[PDB]
CSV table of C-alpha atoms and ligand atoms in Angstrom, one decimal:
chain,number,residue,atom,x,y,z
A,2,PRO,CA,100.3,122.2,89.9
A,3,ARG,CA,104.2,122.0,89.9
A,4,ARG,CA,106.7,123.8,88.2
A,5,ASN,CA,107.4,122.6,84.3
A,6,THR,CA,110.8,120.5,83.8
A,7,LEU,CA,112.0,118.6,80.7
A,8,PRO,CA,111.0,115.8,80.3
A,9,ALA,CA,107.6,114.2,81.4
A,10,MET,CA,106.7,110.9,83.3
A,11,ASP,CA,104.6,109.0,80.7
B,1,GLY,CA,126.4,94.1,83.6
B,2,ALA,CA,123.5,91.6,83.1
B,3,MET,CA,123.0,93.0,79.6
B,4,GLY,CA,127.1,92.3,78.6
B,5,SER,CA,125.5,88.6,76.7
B,6,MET,CA,122.8,90.5,74.7
B,7,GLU,CA,123.0,92.3,71.1
B,8,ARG,CA,123.4,96.0,71.3
B,9,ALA,CA,120.6,96.3,68.8
B,10,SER,CA,118.5,93.6,70.8
B,11,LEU,CA,118.9,96.3,73.7
B,12,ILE,CA,117.9,99.1,71.6
B,13,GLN,CA,115.0,96.7,70.4
B,14,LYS,CA,113.8,95.9,74.2
B,15,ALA,CA,114.1,99.3,75.5
B,16,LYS,CA,111.7,100.5,72.9
B,17,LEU,CA,109.6,97.3,73.9
B,18,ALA,CA,110.3,98.5,77.6
B,19,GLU,CA,108.4,101.6,76.4
B,20,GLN,CA,105.3,100.5,74.9
B,21,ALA,CA,104.7,98.2,77.7
B,22,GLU,CA,105.9,101.1,80.4
B,23,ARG,CA,108.5,98.9,82.1
B,24,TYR,CA,110.6,102.1,82.6
B,25,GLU,CA,113.1,99.7,85.0
B,26,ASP,CA,113.1,96.8,82.3
B,27,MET,CA,113.9,99.9,79.9
B,28,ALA,CA,116.8,101.5,82.4
B,29,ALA,CA,118.6,98.2,82.4
B,30,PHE,CA,118.6,97.8,78.5
B,31,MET,CA,119.4,101.6,78.1
B,32,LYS,CA,122.7,100.9,80.7
B,33,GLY,CA,123.2,98.0,79.3
B,34,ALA,CA,123.5,99.3,75.7
B,35,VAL,CA,126.1,102.4,76.9
B,36,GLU,CA,127.9,99.9,78.6
B,37,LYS,CA,128.9,98.4,75.0
B,38,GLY,CA,131.3,101.2,74.3
B,39,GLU,CA,129.7,102.7,71.5
B,40,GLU,CA,128.4,106.3,70.7
B,41,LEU,CA,125.2,107.2,71.2
B,42,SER,CA,122.9,108.3,68.7
B,43,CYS,CA,120.1,110.9,68.9
B,44,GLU,CA,117.4,108.5,69.4
B,45,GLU,CA,119.4,106.3,71.3
B,46,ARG,CA,120.1,109.2,73.6
B,47,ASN,CA,116.5,110.2,74.1
B,48,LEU,CA,115.5,106.3,75.2
B,49,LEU,CA,118.2,106.7,77.6
B,50,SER,CA,117.0,109.9,79.1
B,51,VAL,CA,113.4,108.5,78.7
B,52,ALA,CA,113.7,105.3,81.2
B,53,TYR,CA,116.0,107.1,83.6
B,54,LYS,CA,113.3,110.3,84.1
B,55,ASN,CA,110.3,107.8,85.0
B,56,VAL,CA,111.9,105.3,87.2
B,57,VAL,CA,113.6,108.6,89.4
B,58,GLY,CA,110.2,110.6,88.5
B,59,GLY,CA,108.0,107.7,90.9
B,60,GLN,CA,111.1,107.7,93.2
B,61,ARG,CA,111.2,111.4,93.2
B,62,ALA,CA,107.5,110.9,94.0
B,63,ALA,CA,106.9,108.2,96.3
B,64,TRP,CA,109.8,110.5,98.2
B,65,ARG,CA,107.2,113.7,99.0
B,66,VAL,CA,104.8,111.5,100.0
B,67,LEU,CA,106.9,109.7,102.7
B,68,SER,CA,108.6,113.4,103.8
B,69,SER,CA,105.4,115.1,104.4
B,70,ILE,CA,103.9,112.0,106.7
B,71,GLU,CA,107.1,112.5,108.5
B,72,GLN,CA,107.1,116.3,108.7
B,73,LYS,CA,103.5,115.9,110.4
B,74,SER,CA,105.0,113.1,112.4
B,75,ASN,CA,107.2,115.6,113.9
B,76,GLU,CA,105.0,118.8,114.1
B,78,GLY,CA,100.7,117.4,119.2
B,79,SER,CA,101.6,114.3,117.0
B,80,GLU,CA,100.9,111.1,118.9
B,81,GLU,CA,104.6,109.6,117.8
B,83,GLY,CA,107.8,104.3,115.5
B,84,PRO,CA,110.8,105.1,112.9
B,85,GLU,CA,108.5,103.4,110.7
B,86,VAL,CA,108.1,106.6,109.1
B,87,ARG,CA,111.9,107.2,108.4
B,88,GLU,CA,113.0,104.2,107.9
B,89,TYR,CA,110.7,104.0,104.4
B,90,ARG,CA,111.4,107.2,103.9
B,91,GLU,CA,115.5,106.4,104.5
B,92,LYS,CA,114.9,103.4,102.3
B,93,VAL,CA,113.2,105.0,99.5
B,94,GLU,CA,115.9,108.1,99.3
B,95,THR,CA,118.6,105.0,99.3
B,96,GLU,CA,117.5,103.9,96.3
B,97,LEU,CA,116.8,107.3,94.6
B,98,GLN,CA,120.2,108.1,95.3
B,99,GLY,CA,121.7,105.1,93.5
B,100,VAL,CA,119.9,105.3,90.6
B,101,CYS,CA,121.1,109.3,90.1
B,102,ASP,CA,124.5,107.9,90.6
B,103,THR,CA,124.2,105.0,88.3
B,104,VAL,CA,123.6,107.6,85.5
B,105,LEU,CA,126.0,109.9,86.9
B,106,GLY,CA,128.4,107.0,86.0
B,107,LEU,CA,127.7,106.3,83.1
B,108,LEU,CA,127.6,109.8,82.3
B,109,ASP,CA,131.2,109.9,83.6
B,110,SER,CA,132.2,105.9,81.9
B,111,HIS,CA,132.4,107.2,79.4
B,112,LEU,CA,129.8,109.3,78.1
B,113,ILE,CA,130.6,113.0,78.1
B,114,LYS,CA,134.2,112.7,77.6
B,115,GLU,CA,133.4,111.1,73.5
B,116,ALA,CA,130.2,113.7,73.3
B,117,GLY,CA,132.6,116.2,70.2
B,118,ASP,CA,129.2,117.7,68.9
B,119,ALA,CA,127.1,120.4,70.5
B,120,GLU,CA,123.7,118.2,70.2
B,121,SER,CA,125.4,115.0,72.5
B,122,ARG,CA,127.6,117.4,74.5
B,123,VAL,CA,124.6,119.3,75.9
B,125,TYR,CA,124.3,114.9,79.1
B,126,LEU,CA,126.1,117.7,80.9
B,127,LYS,CA,122.1,118.2,81.0
B,128,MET,CA,121.0,114.8,82.0
B,129,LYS,CA,123.6,115.6,84.4
B,130,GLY,CA,122.3,118.6,86.2
B,131,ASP,CA,119.0,117.0,86.4
B,132,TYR,CA,120.2,114.3,88.3
B,133,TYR,CA,123.0,116.3,90.6
B,134,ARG,CA,119.3,118.5,90.8
B,135,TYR,CA,117.7,115.0,92.3
B,136,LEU,CA,120.6,114.7,94.8
B,137,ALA,CA,120.1,118.2,95.6
B,138,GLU,CA,116.3,117.8,96.4
B,139,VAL,CA,116.8,115.5,98.8
B,140,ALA,CA,120.7,115.9,100.8
B,141,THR,CA,120.8,117.3,104.3
B,142,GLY,CA,124.3,117.2,105.5
B,143,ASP,CA,127.8,117.9,105.3
B,144,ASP,CA,127.7,118.1,100.8
B,145,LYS,CA,124.7,119.9,100.1
B,146,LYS,CA,126.5,122.8,99.6
B,147,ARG,CA,128.6,121.0,96.8
B,148,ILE,CA,126.0,119.1,95.3
B,149,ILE,CA,124.7,122.2,94.4
B,150,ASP,CA,127.8,123.8,92.9
B,151,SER,CA,128.3,120.5,91.1
B,152,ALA,CA,124.8,121.0,89.5
B,153,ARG,CA,125.1,124.2,88.5
B,154,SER,CA,128.8,124.0,87.4
B,155,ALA,CA,127.6,120.7,84.5
B,156,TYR,CA,124.1,123.9,84.1
B,157,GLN,CA,126.4,126.0,82.5
B,158,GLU,CA,129.3,124.3,80.8
B,159,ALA,CA,125.6,123.4,78.7
B,160,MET,CA,123.9,126.9,78.8
B,161,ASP,CA,128.0,128.2,77.5
B,162,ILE,CA,127.7,125.5,74.7
B,163,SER,CA,124.2,125.7,73.8
B,164,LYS,CA,124.6,129.8,73.1
B,165,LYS,CA,127.7,129.9,71.3
B,166,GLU,CA,126.9,126.4,69.3
B,167,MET,CA,122.8,126.5,68.7
B,168,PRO,CA,120.1,128.1,67.8
B,169,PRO,CA,117.8,130.1,70.4
B,170,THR,CA,115.3,127.4,69.6
B,171,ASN,CA,117.1,124.9,69.5
B,172,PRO,CA,114.6,122.3,71.6
B,173,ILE,CA,117.9,120.9,73.5
B,174,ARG,CA,118.5,124.7,74.1
B,175,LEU,CA,115.0,124.8,75.4
B,176,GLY,CA,114.6,122.3,77.4
B,177,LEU,CA,118.1,122.9,79.3
B,178,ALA,CA,116.9,126.4,80.4
B,180,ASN,CA,115.9,123.5,84.3
B,181,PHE,CA,118.6,125.3,84.3
B,182,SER,CA,115.6,128.6,85.8
B,183,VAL,CA,114.2,125.9,88.3
B,184,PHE,CA,117.1,125.3,89.2
B,185,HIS,CA,117.3,128.0,90.4
B,187,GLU,CA,114.1,125.8,94.2
B,188,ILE,CA,117.3,124.3,95.1
B,189,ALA,CA,119.7,127.8,94.4
B,190,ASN,CA,117.3,130.1,96.2
B,191,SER,CA,118.0,132.6,93.2
B,192,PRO,CA,113.7,132.9,92.3
B,193,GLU,CA,114.9,136.3,90.4
B,194,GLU,CA,117.6,134.4,88.2
B,195,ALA,CA,114.7,131.9,87.8
B,196,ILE,CA,112.4,134.4,86.3
B,197,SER,CA,115.3,136.3,84.3
B,198,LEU,CA,116.4,133.3,83.0
B,199,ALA,CA,112.8,132.1,81.6
B,200,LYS,CA,111.6,135.1,80.0
B,201,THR,CA,115.0,136.2,78.3
B,202,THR,CA,115.2,132.3,77.1
B,203,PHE,CA,111.7,132.6,76.0
B,204,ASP,CA,111.8,136.3,74.0
B,205,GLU,CA,114.9,135.5,71.8
B,206,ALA,CA,113.0,131.7,70.7
B,207,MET,CA,110.1,133.7,70.3
B,208,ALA,CA,112.6,136.5,68.1
B,209,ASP,CA,113.5,133.7,66.1
B,210,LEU,CA,110.2,131.0,65.6
B,211,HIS,CA,109.9,132.8,61.8
B,212,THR,CA,113.1,130.8,60.1
B,213,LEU,CA,111.6,127.2,61.5
B,214,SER,CA,109.2,124.7,58.9
B,215,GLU,CA,105.6,124.1,60.6
B,216,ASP,CA,107.2,121.0,62.4
B,217,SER,CA,110.5,123.0,63.9
B,218,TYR,CA,107.9,125.0,64.8
B,219,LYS,CA,105.9,122.8,66.6
B,220,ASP,CA,108.3,121.8,68.7
B,221,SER,CA,110.2,125.3,69.6
B,222,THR,CA,106.6,126.1,71.1
B,223,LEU,CA,106.2,123.7,72.9
B,224,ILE,CA,109.0,124.1,75.5
B,225,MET,CA,108.7,127.6,75.2
B,226,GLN,CA,105.2,127.1,76.9
B,227,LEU,CA,106.5,125.7,79.5
B,228,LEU,CA,108.6,128.4,80.4
B,229,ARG,CA,105.2,130.7,79.6
B,230,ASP,CA,103.2,128.9,82.9
B,231,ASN,CA,106.7,129.1,85.0
B,232,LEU,CA,107.1,132.2,84.4
B,233,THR,CA,102.9,132.2,84.7
B,234,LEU,CA,103.0,130.5,88.8
B,235,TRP,CA,106.7,132.7,89.3
B,236,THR,CA,105.2,135.7,88.5
C,1,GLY,CA,112.5,85.7,104.2
C,2,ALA,CA,114.2,89.5,103.6
C,3,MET,CA,111.5,90.8,106.4
C,4,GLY,CA,111.8,88.3,109.2
C,5,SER,CA,113.4,90.4,111.2
C,6,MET,CA,111.4,93.3,111.2
C,7,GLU,CA,108.4,93.0,113.8
C,8,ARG,CA,104.7,92.8,112.3
C,9,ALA,CA,103.1,96.1,113.2
C,10,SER,CA,106.0,97.8,111.5
C,11,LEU,CA,105.4,95.7,107.8
C,12,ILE,CA,101.9,96.7,108.1
C,13,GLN,CA,102.2,100.3,109.5
C,14,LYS,CA,105.5,100.4,106.0
C,15,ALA,CA,102.7,98.4,103.4
C,16,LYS,CA,100.1,101.1,104.5
C,17,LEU,CA,102.9,104.0,103.6
C,18,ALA,CA,103.7,101.8,100.6
C,19,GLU,CA,100.4,102.2,99.3
C,20,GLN,CA,100.3,106.3,99.6
C,21,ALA,CA,103.8,106.4,98.2
C,22,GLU,CA,101.8,103.4,95.7
C,23,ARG,CA,105.0,101.5,95.6
C,24,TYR,CA,103.1,98.2,95.2
C,25,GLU,CA,105.9,95.9,95.0
C,26,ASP,CA,107.6,97.5,98.5
C,27,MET,CA,103.6,96.9,99.6
C,28,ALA,CA,103.7,93.4,98.5
C,29,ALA,CA,107.2,92.7,100.1
C,30,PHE,CA,105.8,94.0,103.7
C,31,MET,CA,102.5,91.9,103.2
C,32,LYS,CA,104.2,89.1,102.7
C,33,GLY,CA,106.5,89.4,105.2
C,34,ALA,CA,103.2,90.0,107.4
C,35,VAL,CA,102.4,87.2,106.4
C,36,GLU,CA,105.1,85.1,107.2
C,37,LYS,CA,104.9,85.8,110.7
C,38,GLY,CA,103.0,82.9,110.7
C,39,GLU,CA,99.7,84.8,113.1
C,40,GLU,CA,96.0,85.0,110.8
C,41,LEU,CA,95.4,88.2,109.2
C,42,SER,CA,92.5,90.9,110.0
C,43,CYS,CA,90.0,91.6,107.6
C,44,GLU,CA,92.0,95.1,106.8
C,45,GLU,CA,95.1,93.2,106.7
C,46,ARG,CA,93.4,91.0,104.2
C,47,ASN,CA,92.8,94.2,102.2
C,48,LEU,CA,96.5,95.6,102.5
C,49,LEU,CA,97.8,91.6,101.0
C,50,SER,CA,94.6,91.6,98.5
C,51,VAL,CA,95.2,95.5,97.1
C,52,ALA,CA,99.4,95.2,96.8
C,53,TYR,CA,99.6,91.5,95.3
C,54,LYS,CA,96.1,92.8,93.1
C,55,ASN,CA,98.8,95.9,91.7
C,56,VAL,CA,102.2,94.7,90.6
C,57,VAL,CA,100.1,91.4,89.1
C,58,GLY,CA,97.8,94.4,87.2
C,59,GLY,CA,101.0,96.2,85.3
C,60,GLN,CA,102.5,93.2,84.8
C,61,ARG,CA,99.5,91.6,82.7
C,62,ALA,CA,98.4,95.0,81.1
C,63,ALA,CA,103.0,94.2,79.5
C,64,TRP,CA,102.3,91.0,79.0
C,65,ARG,CA,98.9,91.6,77.4
C,66,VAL,CA,100.8,95.0,75.4
C,67,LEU,CA,103.7,92.6,74.4
C,68,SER,CA,101.6,89.6,73.1
C,69,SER,CA,100.0,91.4,70.7
C,70,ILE,CA,103.0,93.4,69.1
C,71,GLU,CA,104.1,89.7,69.6
C,72,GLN,CA,100.7,88.5,67.0
C,73,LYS,CA,101.4,91.4,64.9
C,74,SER,CA,105.2,89.8,64.5
C,75,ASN,CA,104.2,86.5,62.6
C,76,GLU,CA,101.1,87.6,59.8
C,78,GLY,CA,103.4,90.3,55.4
C,79,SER,CA,105.3,90.7,58.6
C,80,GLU,CA,109.4,91.9,58.2
C,81,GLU,CA,111.0,89.4,60.4
C,83,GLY,CA,114.0,88.5,65.7
C,84,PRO,CA,113.4,86.5,68.4
C,85,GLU,CA,113.4,90.0,71.0
C,86,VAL,CA,109.5,90.3,71.2
C,87,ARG,CA,109.5,87.1,72.2
C,88,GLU,CA,112.3,86.9,74.8
C,89,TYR,CA,110.9,90.0,76.7
C,90,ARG,CA,107.3,89.2,76.2
C,91,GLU,CA,108.7,85.2,77.9
C,92,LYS,CA,110.9,87.4,80.6
C,93,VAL,CA,107.9,89.4,81.9
C,94,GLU,CA,105.6,86.3,81.8
C,95,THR,CA,107.7,84.6,83.7
C,96,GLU,CA,108.5,87.4,86.0
C,97,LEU,CA,104.5,87.5,86.6
C,98,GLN,CA,104.4,83.6,86.9
C,99,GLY,CA,106.3,83.9,90.0
C,100,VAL,CA,104.2,86.5,91.3
C,101,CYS,CA,101.0,84.1,91.1
C,102,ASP,CA,103.4,81.3,92.0
C,103,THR,CA,103.9,83.4,95.7
C,104,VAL,CA,100.9,84.7,96.2
C,105,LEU,CA,98.8,81.2,95.8
C,106,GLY,CA,102.4,79.9,98.3
C,107,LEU,CA,101.4,82.3,101.0
C,108,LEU,CA,97.2,80.5,100.8
C,109,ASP,CA,98.3,77.1,100.5
C,110,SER,CA,101.4,78.1,103.9
C,111,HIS,CA,99.0,78.0,105.6
C,112,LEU,CA,96.4,81.2,104.8
C,113,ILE,CA,93.1,79.1,103.7
C,114,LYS,CA,94.2,76.2,106.6
C,115,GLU,CA,93.5,78.5,109.6
C,116,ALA,CA,90.7,80.3,107.8
C,117,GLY,CA,87.8,79.7,109.9
C,118,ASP,CA,84.9,82.0,109.9
C,119,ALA,CA,83.5,82.0,106.6
C,120,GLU,CA,84.7,86.0,105.8
C,121,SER,CA,88.2,85.0,105.9
C,122,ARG,CA,88.0,81.4,104.0
C,123,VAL,CA,85.8,83.1,101.2
C,125,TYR,CA,91.4,83.3,100.1
C,126,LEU,CA,89.9,81.0,97.8
C,127,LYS,CA,88.5,83.5,95.8
C,128,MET,CA,92.2,84.6,95.5
C,129,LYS,CA,93.3,81.3,95.0
C,130,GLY,CA,91.1,81.5,91.7
C,131,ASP,CA,92.5,84.9,91.0
C,132,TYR,CA,95.6,84.1,91.1
C,133,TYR,CA,95.2,80.2,88.9
C,134,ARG,CA,92.7,82.6,86.7
C,135,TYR,CA,96.3,84.9,85.8
C,136,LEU,CA,98.2,81.6,85.6
C,137,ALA,CA,94.8,80.4,82.6
C,138,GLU,CA,95.8,84.0,80.8
C,139,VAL,CA,99.0,83.0,80.4
C,140,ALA,CA,99.2,79.6,80.0
C,141,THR,CA,99.3,77.8,76.3
C,142,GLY,CA,100.8,74.1,77.1
C,143,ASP,CA,100.0,70.9,78.5
C,144,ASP,CA,98.7,72.0,82.3
C,145,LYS,CA,96.4,74.9,80.4
C,146,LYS,CA,93.0,72.6,81.1
C,147,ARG,CA,94.8,71.9,84.5
C,148,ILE,CA,95.4,75.5,85.7
C,149,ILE,CA,91.5,75.9,85.1
C,150,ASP,CA,90.1,73.6,87.0
C,151,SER,CA,92.9,74.5,89.6
C,152,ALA,CA,90.9,78.4,89.3
C,153,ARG,CA,87.2,76.9,89.0
C,154,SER,CA,87.8,74.6,91.5
C,155,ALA,CA,89.1,77.2,94.1
C,156,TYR,CA,85.8,79.5,92.8
C,157,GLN,CA,83.2,76.8,93.3
C,158,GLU,CA,84.6,76.3,97.0
C,159,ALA,CA,84.0,80.0,97.9
C,160,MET,CA,80.8,80.2,96.1
C,161,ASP,CA,79.5,77.0,98.5
C,162,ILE,CA,80.6,78.8,101.2
C,163,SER,CA,79.3,82.0,100.4
C,164,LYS,CA,75.7,80.8,99.5
C,165,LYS,CA,75.6,79.2,102.9
C,166,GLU,CA,77.1,81.7,105.2
C,167,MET,CA,76.9,85.0,103.6
C,168,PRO,CA,73.5,87.4,102.8
C,169,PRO,CA,73.7,88.1,99.1
C,170,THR,CA,74.4,91.5,99.5
C,171,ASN,CA,78.0,90.6,101.6
C,172,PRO,CA,80.4,92.8,99.3
C,173,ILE,CA,82.6,89.3,99.3
C,174,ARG,CA,80.2,87.6,98.1
C,175,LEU,CA,79.6,89.8,95.0
C,176,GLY,CA,82.9,89.8,94.0
C,177,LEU,CA,83.5,86.8,94.5
C,178,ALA,CA,80.6,86.9,92.1
C,180,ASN,CA,85.3,87.1,89.2
C,181,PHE,CA,83.6,83.3,88.9
C,182,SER,CA,81.6,85.2,85.8
C,183,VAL,CA,84.4,86.6,84.0
C,184,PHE,CA,86.1,83.2,84.6
C,185,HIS,CA,82.9,81.7,82.9
C,187,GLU,CA,86.8,84.7,79.4
C,188,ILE,CA,88.7,81.8,80.7
C,189,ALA,CA,86.6,79.0,80.4
C,190,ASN,CA,84.5,79.8,77.3
C,191,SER,CA,81.3,79.8,79.0
C,192,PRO,CA,79.6,83.0,78.9
C,193,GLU,CA,75.7,82.0,79.0
C,194,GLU,CA,77.1,80.9,82.6
C,195,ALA,CA,79.1,84.2,83.0
C,196,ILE,CA,75.5,86.4,82.4
C,197,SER,CA,73.1,84.0,84.2
C,198,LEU,CA,75.7,83.9,87.3
C,199,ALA,CA,75.9,87.5,87.3
C,200,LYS,CA,71.8,88.1,86.6
C,201,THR,CA,71.2,85.8,89.7
C,202,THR,CA,73.9,87.3,92.1
C,203,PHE,CA,72.4,91.2,91.0
C,204,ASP,CA,69.0,89.9,90.9
C,205,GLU,CA,69.0,88.8,94.8
C,206,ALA,CA,71.3,91.3,96.2
C,207,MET,CA,69.0,94.0,94.9
C,208,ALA,CA,65.8,92.1,96.7
C,209,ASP,CA,67.9,92.2,99.9
C,210,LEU,CA,69.1,95.7,99.9
C,211,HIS,CA,66.5,96.9,102.1
C,212,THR,CA,68.2,95.0,104.8
C,213,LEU,CA,71.0,97.8,104.7
C,214,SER,CA,71.8,100.8,106.5
C,215,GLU,CA,73.1,103.8,104.0
C,216,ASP,CA,77.3,102.4,104.5
C,217,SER,CA,76.4,99.2,103.7
C,218,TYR,CA,73.8,99.9,100.9
C,219,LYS,CA,76.7,102.1,98.9
C,220,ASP,CA,79.3,99.2,99.3
C,221,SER,CA,77.0,96.7,98.1
C,222,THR,CA,75.9,98.7,94.9
C,223,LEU,CA,79.4,99.6,93.9
C,224,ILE,CA,79.9,96.1,93.0
C,225,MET,CA,76.6,94.8,91.9
C,226,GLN,CA,77.0,98.5,89.4
C,227,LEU,CA,80.3,96.0,88.3
C,228,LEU,CA,78.2,93.5,87.4
C,229,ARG,CA,75.3,95.8,85.6
C,230,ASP,CA,78.2,97.2,82.9
C,231,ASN,CA,79.6,93.7,82.4
C,232,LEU,CA,75.7,92.0,81.8
C,233,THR,CA,75.6,95.7,79.1
C,234,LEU,CA,78.5,94.5,77.6
C,235,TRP,CA,77.8,91.1,77.3
C,236,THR,CA,74.5,91.4,76.2
D,2,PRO,CA,86.5,99.3,78.2
D,3,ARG,CA,87.7,95.8,79.8
D,4,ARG,CA,85.4,94.1,82.2
D,5,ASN,CA,84.9,95.0,85.3
D,6,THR,CA,86.7,92.6,88.0
D,7,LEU,CA,87.8,93.3,91.8
D,8,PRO,CA,89.8,95.1,93.0
D,9,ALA,CA,90.7,97.2,90.8
D,10,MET,CA,94.2,98.6,90.0
D,11,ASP,CA,95.3,102.3,91.8
E,1,LIG,MG1,123.6,89.9,79.1
E,2,LIG,MG1,112.0,141.2,91.9
E,3,LIG,MG1,114.6,91.7,108.2
E,4,LIG,MG1,72.1,82.0,74.9
């Protein structure tokens, strides 16, 4: 699991 | 320049159809051509631009990280050719072009004409695509690309603090800056910014409609998982 | 022609790296350039060519079917512009090029030099990409594109019957011809071919190693679900 | 669910 960034990919 | 003979409204209509089609290169090409009409962009048109370039650079970033790893394993008892290095380079060269294309649209002339807080807080985009260039930079300008990104994030942070409430989704998404802090080697700064941003949005949630509430809690949850992974 | 100054082995190596990267346009571009070196292709190189073009045309087919539907809804109490028709056209024009590119590689000169059953049974590829052209053809050549595909499938079927056992994965994948029978409006022919192909592979499974067994049962299961959906 | 054809997309 990667860290979250805004926004995401489809 | 390819889109210069197509109407602005036509390019917006085809950029959304490209979204539905999941043809994100077309979507970026339409939104680039829309930007280059010279008009300011609506909040909705801002999101189509951002969504299109995020997906293209997003797959380019994914492919780069796959090649880079095979390339690292290639140089550690490893049976030796330049082909891995050549293809990782070409893809990275492709990725650097797309970032350079987005940064060129923010610089000509989306940031200078962005007067409202929500539109101007493009500096986040500007921070994101320097950060993408940072992710692949290894030479005599990697320090300067990082400062390029940090400075952009920090301008957006000051406007967002002064001009938008603490639950504002643009402010919460801006507070990516924390992940930059994986580029900047400042994990304590990363974590402080996220707990601070989270706790102050939490204290403002009672002011929000059920619709705004759902939006803000989404991005506060992206902060909660990051904190969860770092702590 | 872009790949003409890169080594054949280099193009194979970069086509597999493109697979791992999921960069299927690069993968098709490498395998096209590999084909155009003029040498025959190994069974493994055949699969890389097939896998790359299948993914590119596969997303083009997906996007086309999304646009075509919005376009059908656009012409049924519907508030009226040409933009849906223009973009569906461009994508379809793009799709027709890729099929025309694959068919041009089979025709120059992969089918004429393919002497062994397994390699020659390219005619399946030839049937698949005419079928893709068929999926989007509406005019004065749609009858001729269908016959182009049917004829190709039928040549592959005769060689496969005479020269390969009934469990041979290439024969079982060839027996796509049944799905053509959604293009050819022959659903009873579709179902007969699938039950016949399934039952005779089933009777030959006792001859197979545990490895061959798993391969053949995979494609027999793709026939079982199709039969399940049609019956 | 669509019908099956050889091969599939990644
Ligand atoms: Mg134009
Ligand atoms: Mg500490
Ligand atoms: Mg070359
Ligand atoms: Mg009947």
